[PDB]
């Protein structure tokens, strides 16, 4: 009665209650059971009808689109293209929202449930004919580089370590990680979006030793113990159009830093 | 607009004659806080939050102290954090992290030399400008090579130029504490500062980054701390203000710091001479400065006790500690404090040492040398530091762990029945027990002790263990006992303030540790006749005393600048320019940065 603002928490909840109750009755069974919505239409027009269109245009930012706070892909890759830990990164988020009230970066369980999404081995995929010799499921993200490779005191002694993932599920993850820029791709080459031709990739595939990549662990020396890396490369993504193919993506860089993407390591010699 | 406007004018105009006949007509607070509400049912508080934010009218920036605290706080580099500024300004529109001016623009307000500060009487032999920052440390140390080679790099502050800003940092965390004690906010009295001062060596800082061994390297880090903050009000004092958690590495703050071992005597004195120069003239004056408006004044004392054994033993001028004199508190040879168990005192003052020092040089008696040792009680060095004496707490509790643990390892073997063995039976013994400890309590196996060993290895259930390995039984009570009277004596030291926390065990104390000198002298004297290890003396002769001396014996200890040790690496390698003479100076800066209090200020911020 005071008002509405300078009340405790559920205060105001039980002083404006009965209005609550009768008009969100009434609402309810007008349009069939739902109030935050029309509520929310109403609330954007008895406020911007006093001449207040700003926090109405930014309200409908933040109602189903974009505007403030970040998307969990956003905040994921900042957190690993800065090469943050983890502990740090919750450190900025609960200081930053704990300071300016809002949220603009998201939790860490918001961060695992959304890099799910680009680690191989999530999407559905079909070969045909199959495979020979290939496994089928399509669950497979990293698995271990000895592909079972008996190893007891009887047969030859291996000591390395090695994690890869399947060929197939990290080549269809490289696809789904650029189906924006084919699209826009096959777009500006003047054709049709809803076109399923057989497209043609064009790989690259590279494998080179980083020896000595061990470091000094507590005050001390170290031992050269080297290591390996399998990565490949898309490069050159093509379509026969009509009679001829036509080229719908090519890599700007080809031979960059960031454009190589792993696919096995080890740590063996050459 | 319209649309919707007649889609439900009914119920629109209907809700507007309601919250008029009602609610009074505040539709606006009326309406926001109904769609709020059947927000928040739902269970979507995110935009209830934000929406709540934007109505009340928060801008989302940030100030620039903010984005420094987390810059600082969370290490990154002054490129990366330009990625992350970049990002967020172009996605969200509006920018939400300050640029790297503004941050550098409002970082110069915390480093040190920046206010204005004047002294009375003026500080013989200490400049009076104002703006000094990072001084070089050598203190323009004559360098050619007619001269002595000297190499060594050393950065540094002046030392009132550094308590200034420390103080200024907390001018709110100290008036706030003026608040709480029922004091008129708008008081100048005579506050007195305590500072305590800690040095220790930190050596093996490099990196073979051209994966070459055997290149080493050392460094020493000199750093002080602010303790409590008094004022005399009326008829007595007031704590203003105390400092929560001591000896952490987050309240110590650095001074300077080199790169020399921390035995290289002549190049320590040359480097920490200049210090001790402010801290004798900055003890006979006072320091006007406005604190919130008005001006206040401060007087300091200064107690150096964050010194480990090493350290203490050779700059206060004393022979290494492989002596016959053991106690840097008192006089006393080994031989004899092993026989006369727990009657000393504290009588090793820095004056009574420097005098000392001096009957040693003159010789005025014209008396031989190995009586002349004996009259000066082991000193044969002029020391040049006044430090004051007590024992430190983390070595302390370090050295004791390791010493009942080969106390066990030697009840292993049952010498007591069968003496004299030879080292071949002792490293069975030794494998035995740890391969024993390994499979019972799955302690791992470790040459040099951590704290986090010692304090596993201090246990009932451990020495339990190692008593159900071993043969006999008379055993069993001669070590249990010792242990829980070992772990009943523990907490009045390991404690941070236990005047008052553990106020039991302290009272008890005499007769605590006299039951384990008499059992120490008893069932054990086939070890303990004559010689007796150092600490086994620190502890059952002087902190009962020390207590009643100072105060905390835990607060006042190295535990704080040891834990930063690990800090100096990581700012090594991910903030520095690869000048050697700038390594130091940004290391020095962004160490003092992050030991502020006014940004952990707002890393604090979630709690409250
Ligand atoms: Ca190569
Ligand atoms: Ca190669
Ligand atoms: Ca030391
Ligand atoms: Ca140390
Ligand atoms: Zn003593």
Same mark, same amino acid.
């Given at each position: 009665?005071?008002?509405?603002?300078?009340?405790?928490?559920?205060?105001?909840?039980?002083?404006?209650?009965?209005?609550?109750?009768?008009?969100?009755?009434?609402?309810?069974?007008?349009?069939?059971?739902?109030?935050?919505?029309?509520?929310?239409?109403?609330?954007?027009?008895?406020?911007?009808?006093?001449?207040?269109?700003?926090?109405?245009?930014?309200?409908?930012?933040?109602?189903?689109?974009?505007?403030?706070?970040?998307?969990?892909?956003?905040?994921?890759?900042?957190?690993?293209?800065?090469?943050?830990?983890?502990?740090?990164?919750?450190? !900025?988020?609960?200081?930053?929202?704990?300071?300016?009230?809002?949220?603009?970066?998201?939790?860490?369980?918001?961060?695992?449930?959304?890099?799910?999404?680009?680690?191989?081995?999530?999407?559905?995929?079909?070969?045909?004919?199959?495979?020979?010799?290939?496994?089928?499921?399509?669950?497979?993200?990293?698995?271990?580089?000895?592909?079972?490779?008996?190893?007891?005191?009887?047969?030859?002694?291996?000591?390395?370590?090695?994690?890869?993932?399947?060929?197939?599920?990290?080549?269809?993850?490289?696809? !789904?990680?650029?189906?924006?820029?084919?699209?826009?791709?096959?777009?500006?080459?003047?054709?049709?979006?809803?076109?399923?031709?057989?497209?043609?990739?064009?790989?690259?595939?590279?494998?080179?030793? !980083?020896?000595?990549?061990?470091?000094?662990?507590?005050?001390?020396?170290?031992?050269?113990?080297?290591?390996?890396?399998?990565?490949?490369?898309? !490069?050159?993504?093509?379509?026969?159009?009509?009679?001829?193919?036509?080229?719908?993506?090519?890599?700007?860089?080809?031979?960059?830093?960031?454009?190589?993407?792993?696919?096995?390591?080890?740590?063996?010699?050459? | 607009?319209?649309?919707?406007?007649?889609?439900?004018?009914?119920?629109?105009?209907?809700?507007?004659?309601?919250?008029?006949?009602?609610?009074?007509?505040?539709?606006?607070?009326?309406?926001?806080?109904?769609?709020?509400?059947?927000?928040?049912?739902?269970?979507?508080?995110?935009?209830?939050?934000?929406?709540?934010?934007?109505?009340?009218?928060?801008?989302?920036?940030?100030?620039?102290?903010?984005?420094?605290?987390?810059?600082?706080?969370?290490?990154?580099?002054?490129?990366?954090?330009?990625?992350?500024?970049?990002?967020?300004?172009?996605?969200?529109?509006?920018?939400?992290?300050?640029?790297?001016?503004?941050?550098?623009?409002?970082?110069?307000?915390?480093?040190?030399?920046?206010?204005?500060?004047?002294?009375?009487?003026?500080?013989?032999?200490?400049?009076?400008?104002?703006?000094?920052?990072?001084?070089?440390?050598?203190?323009?140390?004559?360098?050619?090579?007619?001269?002595?080679?000297?190499?060594?790099?050393?950065?540094?502050?002046?030392?009132?130029?550094?308590?200034?800003?420390?103080?200024?940092?907390?001018?709110?965390?100290?008036?706030?504490?003026?608040?709480?004690?029922?004091?008129?906010?708008?008081?100048?009295?005579?506050?007195?500062?305590?500072?305590?001062?800690?040095?220790?060596?930190?050596?093996?800082?490099?990196?073979?980054?051209?994966?070459?061994?055997?290149?080493?390297?050392?460094?020493?880090?000199?750093?002080?701390?602010?303790?409590?903050?008094?004022?005399?009000?009326?008829?007595?004092?007031?704590?203003?203000?105390?400092?929560?958690?001591?000896?952490?590495?987050?309240?110590?703050?650095?001074?300077?710091?080199?790169?020399?071992?921390?035995?290289?005597?002549?190049?320590?004195?040359?480097?920490?001479?200049? $210090?001790?120069?402010?801290?004798?003239?900055?003890?006979?004056?006072?320091?006007? $400065?406005?604190?919130?408006?008005?001006?206040?004044?401060?007087?300091?004392?200064?107690?150096?006790?964050?010194?480990?054994?090493?350290?203490?033993?050779?700059?206060?001028?004393?022979?290494?500690?492989?002596?016959?004199?053991?106690?840097?508190?008192?006089?006393?040879?080994? $031989?004899?404090?092993?026989?006369?168990?727990?009657?000393?005192?504290?009588?090793?003052?820095?004056?009574?040492?420097?005098?000392?020092?001096?009957?040693?040089?003159?010789?005025?008696?014209?008396?031989?040398?190995?009586?002349?040792?004996?009259?000066?009680?082991?000193?044969?060095?002029?020391?040049?530091?006044?430090?004051?004496?007590?024992?430190?707490?983390?070595?302390?509790?370090?050295?004791?762990?390791?010493?009942?643990?080969?106390?066990?390892?030697?009840?292993?073997?049952?010498?007591?029945?069968?003496?004299?063995?030879?080292?071949?039976?002792?490293?069975?013994?030794?494998?035995?027990?740890?391969?024993?400890?390994?499979?019972?309590?799955?302690?791992?196996?470790?040459?040099?002790?951590?704290?986090?060993?010692?304090?596993?290895?201090?246990?009932?259930?451990?020495?339990?263990?190692?008593?159900?390995?071993?043969?006999?039984?008379?055993?069993?009570?001669?070590?249990?006992?010792?242990?829980?009277?070992?772990?009943?004596?523990?907490?009045?030291?390991?404690?941070?303030?236990?005047?008052?926390?553990?106020?039991?065990?302290?009272?008890?104390?005499?007769?605590?540790?006299?039951?384990?000198?008499?059992?120490?002298?008893?069932?054990?004297?086939? %070890?303990?006749?004559?010689?007796?290890?150092?600490?086994?003396?620190?502890?059952?002769?002087?902190?009962?005393?020390?207590?009643?001396?100072?105060?905390?014996?835990?607060?006042?200890?190295?535990?704080?600048?040891?834990?930063?040790?690990?800090?100096?690496?990581?700012?090594?390698?991910?903030?520095? %320019?690869?000048?050697?003479?700038?390594?130091?100076?940004?290391?020095?800066?962004?160490?003092?940065?992050?030991?502020?209090?006014?940004?952990?200020?707002?890393?604090?911020?979630?709690?409250?």
């Amino acid at each position: 009665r005071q008002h509405l603002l300078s009340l405790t928490r559920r205060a105001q909840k039980h002083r404006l209650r009965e209005l609550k109750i009768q008009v969100k009755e009434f609402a309810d069974k007008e349009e069939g059971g739902d109030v935050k919505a029309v509520c929310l239409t109403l609330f954007l027009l008895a406020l911007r009808a006093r001449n207040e269109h700003r926090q109405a245009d930014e309200l409908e930012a933040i109602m189903q689109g974009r505007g403030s706070g970040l998307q969990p892909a956003v905040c994921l890759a900042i957190r690993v293209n800065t090469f943050l830990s983890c502990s740090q990164y919750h450190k !900025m988020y609960r200081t930053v929202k704990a300071i300016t009230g809002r949220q603009i970066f998201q939790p860490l369980h918001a961060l695992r449930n959304a890099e799910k999404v680009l680690l191989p081995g999530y999407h559905p995929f079909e070969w045909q004919p199959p495979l020979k010799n290939v496994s089928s499921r399509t669950d497979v993200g990293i698995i271990d580089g000895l592909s079972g490779l008996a190893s007891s005191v009887d047969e030859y002694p291996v000591d390395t370590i090695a994690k890869r993932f399947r060929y197939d599920s990290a080549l269809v993850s490289a696809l !789904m990680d650029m189906e924006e820029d084919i699209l826009e791709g096959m777009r500006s080459q003047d054709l049709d979006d809803y076109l399923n031709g057989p497209f043609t990739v064009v790989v690259k595939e590279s494998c080179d030793g !980083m020896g000595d990549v061990s470091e000094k662990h507590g005050s001390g020396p170290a031992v050269p113990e080297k290591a390996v890396r399998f990565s490949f490369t898309v !490069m050159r993504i093509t379509i026969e159009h009509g009679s001829q193919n036509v080229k719908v993506f090519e890599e700007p860089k080809p031979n960059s830093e960031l454009c190589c993407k792993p696919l096995c390591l080890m740590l063996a010699d050459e | 607009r319209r649309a919707q406007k007649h889609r439900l004018r009914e119920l629109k105009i209907q809700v507007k004659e309601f919250a008029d006949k009602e609610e009074g007509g505040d539709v606006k607070a009326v309406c926001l806080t109904l769609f709020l509400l059947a927000l928040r049912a739902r269970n979507e508080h995110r935009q209830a939050d934000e929406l709540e934010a934007i109505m009340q009218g928060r801008g989302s920036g940030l100030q620039p102290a903010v984005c420094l605290a987390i810059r600082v706080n969370t290490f990154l580099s002054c490129s990366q954090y330009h990625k992350m500024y970049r990002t967020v300004k172009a996605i969200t529109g509006r920018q939400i992290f300050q640029p790297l001016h503004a941050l550098r623009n409002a970082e110069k307000v915390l480093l040190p030399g920046y206010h204005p500060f004047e002294w009375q009487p003026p500080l013989k032999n200490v400049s009076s400008r104002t703006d000094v920052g990072i001084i070089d440390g050598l203190s323009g140390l004559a360098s050619s090579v007619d001269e002595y080679p000297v190499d060594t790099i050393a950065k540094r502050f002046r030392y009132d130029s550094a308590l200034v800003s420390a103080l200024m940092d907390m001018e709110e965390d100290i008036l706030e504490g003026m608040r709480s004690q029922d004091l008129d906010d708008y008081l100048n009295g005579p506050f007195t500062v305590v500072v305590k001062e800690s040095c220790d060596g930190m050596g093996d800082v490099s990196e073979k980054h051209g994966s070459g061994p055997a290149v080493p390297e050392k460094a020493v880090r000199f750093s002080f701390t602010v303790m409590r903050i008094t004022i005399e009000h009326g008829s007595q004092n007031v704590k203003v203000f105390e400092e929560p958690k001591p000896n952490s590495e987050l309240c110590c703050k650095p001074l300077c710091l080199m790169l020399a071992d921390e035995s290289d005597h002549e190049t320590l004195t040359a480097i920490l001479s200049p $210090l001790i120069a402010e801290r004798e003239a900055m003890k006979s004056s006072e320091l006007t $400065l406005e604190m919130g408006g008005i001006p206040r004044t401060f007087k300091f004392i200064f107690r150096g006790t964050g010194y480990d054994e090493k350290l203490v033993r050779e700059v206060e001028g004393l022979e290494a500690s492989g002596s016959v004199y053991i106690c840097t508190l008192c006089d006393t040879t080994r $031989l004899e404090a092993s026989q006369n168990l727990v009657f000393h005192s504290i009588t090793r003052s820095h004056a009574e040492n420097l005098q000392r020092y001096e009957v040693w040089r003159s010789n005025p008696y014209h008396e031989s040398v190995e009586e002349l040792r004996d009259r000066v009680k082991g000193v044969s060095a002029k020391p040049f530091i006044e430090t004051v004496p007590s024992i430190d707490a983390l070595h302390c509790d370090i050295g004791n762990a390791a010493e009942f643990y080969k106390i066990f390892q030697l009840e292993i073997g049952e010498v007591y029945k069968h003496p004299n063995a030879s080292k071949e039976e002792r490293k069975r013994w030794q494998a035995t027990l740890d391969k024993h400890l390994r499979k019972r309590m799955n302690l791992k196996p470790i040459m040099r002790m951590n704290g986090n060993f010692a304090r596993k290895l201090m246990t009932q259930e451990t020495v339990d263990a190692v008593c159900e390995l071993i043969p006999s039984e008379e055993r069993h009570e001669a070590l249990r006992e010792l242990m829980d009277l070992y772990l009943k004596m523990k907490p009045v030291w390991r404690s941070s303030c236990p005047a008052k926390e553990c106020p039991e065990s302290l009272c008890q104390y005499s007769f605590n540790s006299q039951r384990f000198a008499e059992l120490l002298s008893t069932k054990f004297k086939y %070890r303990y006749e004559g010689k007796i290890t150092n600490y086994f003396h620190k502890t059952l002769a002087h902190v009962p005393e020390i207590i009643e001396r100072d105060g905390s014996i835990g607060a006042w200890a190295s535990e704080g600048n040891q834990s930063g040790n690990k800090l100096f690496r990581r700012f090594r390698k991910m903030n520095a %320019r690869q000048s050697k003479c700038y390594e130091m100076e940004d290391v020095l800066k962004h160490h003092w940065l992050y030991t502020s209090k006014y940004l952990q200020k707002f890393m604090n911020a979630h709690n409250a």
